[PDB]
Ligand binder design. Structure first.
Ligand code: SAH
Ligand code: ZN
Ligand code: ZN
Ligand code: ZN
Ligand code: ZN
Length: 269
């Protein structure tokens, strides 16, 4: 039995695996964050009451979800010292599901493929063109507390892929770990010159979605990457987004970028 869809039917579109007859190490798929040990906020619970727009579209000035201008353009592309927080209209907003401020919530819109890279283990690539600015995928998994993070990191062995990420927004802190239960974003490799940008996007919950948007046009078969240090295009003091690992060895980076630093920029413990 060859597993056709790495996402197990749980996303809008299947995600294939390559090469034929090869599959990544098993994990439990989830399209969305789930509660993990130490989480104090259930990421599935509604926290935000939404906007009051019902008679006319949600627009800046009148939509309490759009207090910092439109997040997205009409093609659903992300527009664009302190960073403006992004809120989508949510399950409680009475605007229609066509509202231009509903984008991450709509889910995957491209066909991706988990594939064996030359030196980085499995990665994720697109099988189709993705326009600059378009939502690509979340990085979703168990939402953990700080001590649980510490507990898991300290067990990371030498060949372990490291997946926990720490999001700090200035402090709101969110730890997401798709190691055991996670979505397809867990397969994104790091690049020193990546093609995705991660933005914390709030929808129903105070626990943000870690939404990756295309930072440039991405062509078919192009591998999808983001910066594990979270520095790429991160030009405010407001939001650090750091992948964590254990141990003092600096792991080599094989991203191939001209500005490669030669090391994978985990925050080590
Ligand atoms: N630019 C890069 N250079 C070398 N290894 C990388 C890399 N980006 C990601 N990795 C590898 O991928 C791990 C992060 S999880 C990313 C998916 C992973 N390659 C997998 O097969 O499941 C890293 O710990 C490292 O093993
Ligand atoms: Zn509104
Ligand atoms: Zn709204
Ligand atoms: Zn709306
Ligand atoms: Zn690199």
């Amino acid at each position: 039995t060859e597993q056709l869809d790495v996402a197990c039917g749980q996303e809008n579109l299947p995600v294939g695996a390559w090469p034929p007859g090869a599959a990544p190490a098993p994990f439990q798929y989830t399209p969305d964050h789930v509660v993990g040990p130490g989480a104090d906020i259930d990421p599935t619970q509604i926290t935000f009451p939404g906007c009051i727009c019902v008679k006319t579209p949600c627009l800046p000035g009148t939509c309490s979800c759009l207090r910092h201008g439109e997040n997205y353009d009409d093609n659903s592309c992300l527009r664009d010292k302190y960073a403006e927080p992004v809120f989508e209209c949510n399950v409680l907003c009475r605007c229609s599901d066509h509202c231009r401020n509903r984008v991450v919530q709509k889910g995957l819109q491209f066909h991706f493929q988990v594939f064996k890279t030359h030196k980085k283990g499995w990665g994720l690539r697109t099988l189709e063109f993705i326009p600059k600015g378009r939502f690509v995928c979340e990085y979703a998994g168990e939402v953990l507390g700080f001590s649980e993070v510490q507990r898991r990191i300290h067990l990371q062995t030498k060949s372990d892929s490291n997946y926990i990420i720490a999001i700090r927004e200035h402090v709101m802190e969110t730890f997401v770990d798709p190691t055991y239960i996670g979505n397809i974003g867990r397969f994104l490799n790091h690049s020193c010159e990546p093609n995705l940008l991660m933005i914390p996007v709030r929808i129903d919950s105070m626990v943000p979605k870690l939404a990756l948007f295309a930072a440039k046009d991405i062509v078919p078969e192009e591998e999808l990457s983001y910066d594990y240090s979270g520095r790429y295009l991160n030009l405010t003091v407001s939001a650090s987004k750091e992948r964590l690992d254990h141990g003092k060895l600096r792991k080599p980076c094989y991203c191939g970028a001209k500005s490669c630093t030669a090391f994978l920029p985990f925050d080590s413990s």
